[PDB]
A paper describes a structure:
YsxC (YihA in Escherichia coli) is a 22 kDa essential GTPase in Bacillus subtilis. Depletion of YsxC in cells leads to the accumulation of a 50S assembly intermediate known as the 44.5SYsxC particle. YsxC binds in the body of the 44.5S large ribosome assembly intermediate, occupying the site where uL2 binds and controls the timing in the folding of rRNA helices forming the binding site for uL2. Overall, these results suggest that YsxC serves as a placeholder factor for r-protein uL2 and provide the first example of the involvement of such a factor in the ribosome assembly process in bacteria.
In this experiment, we incubated the 44.5SYsxC particles with YsxC in a buffer containing GMPPNP. Importantly, none of the three maps contained density for uL2. Instead, they showed an additional density bound in the uL2 binding site that resembled the crystal structure of YsxC. Class 1, representing the most immature particle, captured the majority of the particles (89%). This class was structurally similar to class 1 in the untreated 44.5SYsxC particle sample, except that YsxC was now bound in the previously vacant binding site for uL2. In our study, we used the cryo-EM map of the YsxC-GMPPNP-treated 44.5SYsxC particle class 1, which had the highest resolution, to explore the binding site of YsxC in the ribosomal particle at the molecular level. We discovered that YsxC inserts itself into the binding site of uL2 and partially occupies the location of H66, preventing this helix from adopting its mature conformation and becoming visible. Consequently, simultaneous binding of YsxC and uL2 is not possible. In its binding site, YsxC contacts six of the rRNA helices also contacted by uL2, including H33, H34, H35a, H52, H55, and H58. Our cryo-EM structure of YsxC bound to the 44.5SYsxC particle mimics the GTP state of the enzyme since it was obtained in the presence of the non-hydrolyzable GTP variant, GMPPNP.
Residue numbers in the entry:
A (entry chain b): 2 to 46
B (entry chain J): 4 to 145
C (entry chain L): 1 to 37
D (entry chain Q): 2 to 118
E (entry chain R): 2 to 102
F (entry chain S): 2 to 110
G (entry chain E): 53 to 68, 73 to 206
RNA sequence: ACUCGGUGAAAUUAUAGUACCUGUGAAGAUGCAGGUUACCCGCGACAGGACGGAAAGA
RNA sequence: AACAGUGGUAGGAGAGCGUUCUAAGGGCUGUGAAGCCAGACCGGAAGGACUGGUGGAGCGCUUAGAAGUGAGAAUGCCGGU
RNA sequence: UAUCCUUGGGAGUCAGACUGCGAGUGAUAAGAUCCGUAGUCGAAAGGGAAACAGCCCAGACCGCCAGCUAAGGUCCCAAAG
RNA sequence: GACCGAUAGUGAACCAGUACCGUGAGGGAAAGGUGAAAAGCACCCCGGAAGGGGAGUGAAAGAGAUCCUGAAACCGUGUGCCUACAAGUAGUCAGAGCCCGUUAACGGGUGAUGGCGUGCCUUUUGUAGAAUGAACCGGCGAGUUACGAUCUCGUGCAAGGUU
């Protein structure tokens, strides 16, 4: 259970390809123009 | 100054009838045709061959007792998973694969060899669907 | 003899041999002493 | 007096790192592996400057064989006939050009055929 | 177009094209001449025994130069053997004139 | 075009680039909403930098807040602070508190 | 040296092995392997060699016409200006060496400030200040003294 | 343990785009020869190899 | 010029390239020195120029002289990552 | 055919390995057992024996997209019946 | 001073025998540089602040307080070429296509495909090994000096030479 060798840059970058975030689901508030998460609340919107 | 060929390649279609022929003697000439060794513009890295259609694949001949004692093996991947069948079964049920195995084994290994093999068509019977390519008739030299 | 054109007598001065300064000089790794001897 | 030295070391290592331009990953970045790769490249370049002369003759022979069998001869018979006629001065390289650019060179094959009888 | 032999090697030349020969002595501006013409292809073809008798290709000299430098480096592993050397091979730039007489 | 930089921000650069990738290239008004609705700890900081960039574009160069888009957006590494003895509670050693430089550029489309 | 650097006695290591000294030459601390050491560089030549050398330099300077023999050099006043005027009178625009008989003081005080002039007495001439200075001014008495010494 | 938010080490490390079989070989082949298989990138498991460490005979 | 020769470990012999300093002669440089970055130039090698950028005050050529004289390996030492 | 003698300066080297001949040795065929004796590697790249320190051919100053051969080979991989 | 020039030179160029370590005897560091002059950023804007963008000082603000120069490892953003049927000490030789345009030179970048190709060092009869060492980069790091002996070459004088 000991790393036999260091990890190259290219393999590290390849492994980090699924490690990213998603754009949120946002809708605009009927009254106002604020943006909130869909199915979330904003009467103050 | 020697001319290497690229995008100037023009291929033809040839029909070879394997009725009274030996497996190895036909396959050598066919593989040489596929690799393009019969053309003055042959270059070793651009696949200047041409297409070959082989008909009557079930009529091929094997000398000696090869029809009984030549075994075709294959190991799938499982340890000790080696299955086999004799050349009689191969010619009676899967002629096309039997010709393809030889011609493939006589071709160079790598990407270019696999492309060259892609240029080959084998048919049991006497008819082929490639009349639109207007192929010619090629006679084996030896 | 001017002070900017000093010339030694030919053959009176020889350059010292510096040992252990690369394999291209012939006296590199083992420094001319060879192996254990 | 004392001598420090940094400039000569930096320049000598930078020359090697610049020669290692285009290699993969660490082999164009770190001096120790770039030096090894440059030495290997020197050896390979010598060996392949010999193998190139080896290989182009092989290509020429292949093309001559093809164009000669397009006439009813083989390479060996055609070369023997050509040498037997003194016209063999003509090379293999020049023959091969006169096979992709002027197959009317068959004239030479006709001469060899005539001499082979 | 003829086939000459100049540098212990043969070349194929047509009028107007520029060729590179081995040193070939001479001097820029001079008109060199080749004697060993082995084949005169074209409309009338003259395959010649050894050389086509009575065949000469004239040419003009443009410059005497040396090619791009090659660094010859060789070494032996484990034995501390290195050797480095430079090389620029001289040539001659020549333009083909009248490929007969 | 207008720029705004936040230097030596107490955040690991690798964690800030996750949000920076989300927001770059977007229209400047839409980008603020994404930052407001993303649940990450770099969002507030990047939002402050973006608002600062928008402000400079109107008070200093007289460009309009609409018709603005995020041209460049990247995160660099800042001086690292080294805590040699997290012996407090932790049994670790030489912890590295990393740091970031956040830069955002906006311009007219 | 590696033994003259402060500290170094204990073997730096222990545990909870022990090898070397924090003052070995490969440590950042200190210890120079050979380095310089105070010594003299002087040596001697055979006396005949010295005489031949001085004679050769004098004759060489004679050949190139870089010698001017003055009846006498006397200064009523010790002014640098007067030496400058005299030197210009003899067309001496570069480094010069003046040789007197028995070290008169008015000449020594003048030309002391002129940046390329050096004044010595008869028994002070030597190879360096003859080769170095382009021109040679010498009085007739100093010529006699040098001739009779050698 | 796993997913999400916050924070965040260590042993190890010649470079590395690191398949399998049969041979060859100064110790036991990923890297040699011949063949057979295999679209690119991950996540969770296993413990087969691990030239991992324990061991110990001796 | 005519021949002949030019694989190489330990090792013997020869010819050179660079670095710091000192002496002499000659010079550069605020209209931009050393250093740093880039380039498709020159020499048989060690190496050497020329252009452009940055830099903001010193440097180099010829002949000699003297060395704390050239780094990829020491489970080297120190720092950074 | 161009080597070999003397004197002087400087050395490195002191577990060699494998293969073939002998028939000195179990003199016979030996294997042995060493004994000799030659070669190659060590310090030798290139072609062949699939791969291969020691076998076979052959000794790399550097370039060329020229030619003739050695061992070994000429259905295809792979140059040539 | 043919001595060092901030890993050097004293251990100590800086509040150094200090900080730290040890019960104690004792051991024992790291750490220099704004600018000629503080003229060291009034005022406006975003921000709780930090930090920025203008304005201003200045020759220079990419000289703004660990503030001369600022290399390499290491970390990123943009883009020209290639890449999702392919088996590799990663190069080398041959080679289309595409993109550029140089100290104009049988130019530069990238490279689909084909051939060849078992890292460097040390050691050993012999290594690709399951011998040994190195995570990477940078700096520092090993045949000297004195006194004797002997040999060669140079210079002077020579049966004499030298202090």
């Amino acid at each position: 259970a000991v790393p036999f060798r260091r990890t190259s840059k290219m393999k590290k970058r390849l492994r980090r390809t699924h490690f990213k975030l998603n754009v949120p689901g946002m809708t605009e508030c009927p009254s106002c123009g604020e943006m909130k998460l869909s199915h979330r609340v904003c009467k103050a919107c | 100054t020697p001319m290497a060929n690229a995008s100037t390649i023009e291929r033809k279609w040839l029909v070879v009838d394997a009725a009274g022929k030996t497996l190895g003697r036909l396959s050598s000439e066919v593989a040489a045709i596929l690799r393009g060794k019969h053309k003055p513009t042959y270059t070793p890295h651009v696949d200047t061959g041409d297409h070959v259609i082989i008909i009557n694949a079930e009529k091929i001949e094997l000398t000696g007792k090869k029809l009984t004692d030549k075994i075709y093996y294959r190991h799938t991947q499982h340890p000790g998973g080696l299955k086999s069948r004799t050349a009689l079964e191969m010619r009676t049920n899967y002629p096309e694969k039997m010709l393809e195995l030889a011609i493939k084994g006589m071709l160079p290994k790598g990407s270019l060899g696999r492309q060259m093999f892609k240029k080959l068509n084998v048919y049991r019977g006497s008819e082929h669907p490639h009349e639109a390519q207007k192929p010619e008739v090629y006679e084996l030299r030896g | 003899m001017k002070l900017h054109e000093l010339k030694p007598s030919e053959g009176s001065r020889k350059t010292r041999n510096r040992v252990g300064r690369g394999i291209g000089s012939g006296n590199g790794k083992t420094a001319g002493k060879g192996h254990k001897g | 007096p004392r001598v420090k030295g940094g400039t000569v070391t930096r320049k000598r290592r930078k020359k090697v790192l610049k020669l290692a331009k285009g290699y993969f990953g660490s082999k164009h970045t770190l001096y120790k592996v770039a030096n090894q790769q440059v030495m290997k490249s020197g050896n390979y370049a010598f060996r392949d400057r010999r193998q190139k002369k080896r290989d182009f003759r092989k290509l020429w022979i292949t093309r001559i064989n093809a164009a000669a069998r397009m006439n009813g001869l083989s390479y060996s018979r055609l070369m023997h006939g050509l040498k037997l006629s003194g016209i063999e001065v003509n090379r293999k390289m020049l023959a091969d050009l006169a096979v992709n650019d002027l197959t009317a060179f068959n004239q030479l094959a006709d001469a060899a055929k005539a001499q082979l009888n | 177009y003829a086939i000459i032999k100049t540098g212990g090697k043969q070349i194929k030349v047509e009028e107007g094209q520029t060729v590179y020969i081995e040193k070939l002595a001479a001097e820029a501006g001079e008109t060199v001449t080749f004697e060993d013409v082995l084949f005169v292809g074209g409309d009338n073809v003259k395959v010649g025994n050894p050389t086509v008798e009575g065949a000469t290709v004239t040419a003009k000299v443009e410059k005497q130069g040396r090619a791009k430098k090659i660094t010859v480096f060789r070494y032996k592993p484990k034995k501390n053997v290195h050797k480095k050397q430079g090389h620029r091979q001289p040539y001659t730039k020549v333009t083909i004139e009248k490929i007969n007489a | 075009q207008a720029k705004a930089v936040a230097r030596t921000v107490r955040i690991a650069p690798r964690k800030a680039r996750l949000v920076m990738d989300l927001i770059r290239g977007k229209q400047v008004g839409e980008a603020v909403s994404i930052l407001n609705l993303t649940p990450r700890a770099a969002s507030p900081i990047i939002e402050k930098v973006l608002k600062s960039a928008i402000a400079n574009a109107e008070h200093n160069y007289e460009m309009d807040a609409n018709n603005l888009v995020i041209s460049q957006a990247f995160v660099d590494e800042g001086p690292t602070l080294k805590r040699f003895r997290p012996r407090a509670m932790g049994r670790a050693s030489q912890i590295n508190k990393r740091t970031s430089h956040i830069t955002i550029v906006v311009s007219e489309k | 040296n590696r033994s003259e650097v402060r500290g170094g006695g204990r073997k730096p290591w222990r545990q909870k092995a022990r090898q070397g000294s924090i003052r070995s030459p490969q440590w950042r601390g200190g210890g120079v392997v050979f380095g310089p050491t105070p010594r003299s560089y002087s040596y001697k030549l055979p006396k005949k060699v010295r005489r031949l050398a001085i004679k050769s330099v004098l004759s060489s300077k004679v050949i190139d016409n870089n010698i001017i023999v003055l009846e006498d050099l006397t200064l009523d006043t010790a002014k640098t200006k007067e030496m400058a005027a005299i030197l210009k009178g003899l067309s001496v625009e570069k480094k010069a060496l003046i040789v007197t008989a028995d070290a008169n003081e008015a000449v020594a005080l003048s030309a002391r400030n002129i940046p390329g002039v050096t004044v010595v007495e008869a028994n002070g001439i030597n190879v360096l200040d003859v080769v170095n200075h382009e021109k040679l001014l010498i009085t007739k008495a100093a010529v006699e003294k040098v001739e009779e010494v050698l």
